[PDB]
Swiss-Prot record:
Protein name: Endothiapepsin
Record's keyword terms, sorted: Aspartyl protease, Disulfide bond, Hydrolase, Protease, Signal, Zymogen
Top-rank taxon, per record: Eukaryota
Species this protein is from: Cryphonectria parasitica
UniProt entry tagged with the keyword Amino-acid biosynthesis: no
Family per record: Belongs to the peptidase A1 family.
Amino acid sequence: STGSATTTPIDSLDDAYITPVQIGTPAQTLNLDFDTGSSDLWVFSSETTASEVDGQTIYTPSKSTTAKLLSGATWSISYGDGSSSSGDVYTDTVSVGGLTVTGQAVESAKKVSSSFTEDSTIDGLLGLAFSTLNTVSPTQQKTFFDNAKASLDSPVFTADLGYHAPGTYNFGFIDTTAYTGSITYTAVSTKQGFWEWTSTGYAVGSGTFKSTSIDGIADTGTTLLYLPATVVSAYWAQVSGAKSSSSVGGYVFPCSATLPSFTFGVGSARIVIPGDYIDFGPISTGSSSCFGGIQSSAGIGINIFGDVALKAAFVVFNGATTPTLGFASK
């Protein structure tokens, strides 16, 4: 089997991407944030505290003839940005782009933190990291991909995120029309539950490539590119007037700037992030200070190849017995 679904930016800055997902019988379609950095499929629901729902579409398990309470199961997750959610668990039928999993754990939110409430466009998360990170207790549950994998034509999914435009998540096949040149594959460590890999270095603009190992995670659920402070400083030093602002919470730059590209290495191959991908717009409405898309990972504790990086590539999440990651230009 295979599946193919379009993923769409939630706003004009590509702050996140949503993908329609069918849950239950009859189908209830929710727009979920596909997140290769976590492993819970959770949704706003009829059980979510009313004051914490503000415009999201909810899953109502009582209206699904295939929903079953997973008795005694609870979940609770906290993400790197301090956001969180928790609740109980149903199993139900879940379909993405024509690919169907029966008995998928659908984690129903009883509580969500303020940033989730405040984002009316995201109805939940669909985790695509390794199932070892799943938070369901006392019986850990599998991700949608883990459940689908054996049925897929090939045990892979691909992320093809757009810049200020829709893109595609495919399951079970590699669309050879969706990228240019060849796909370069690179090793993955699953030890921390992430799609963790090591970039071979970077360049800023037309500058020379610096060969240096950068361990980090391929994370569609993080907006920006978070890298070591040394790398980030080298980038922003090429932008007149750019500075790290403690009050704003990262590097800002004059909105009048033309940003340089940023290149990262994948083995001997190179992925080029155009300068415009690194512009996240005014820090507040009407400001001439703009927020940068490349930020320091210092104090996160891990480097993160988030959407800013991934959207410059066609990315293969290869779930073979020994997982690997593939990157192609597009």
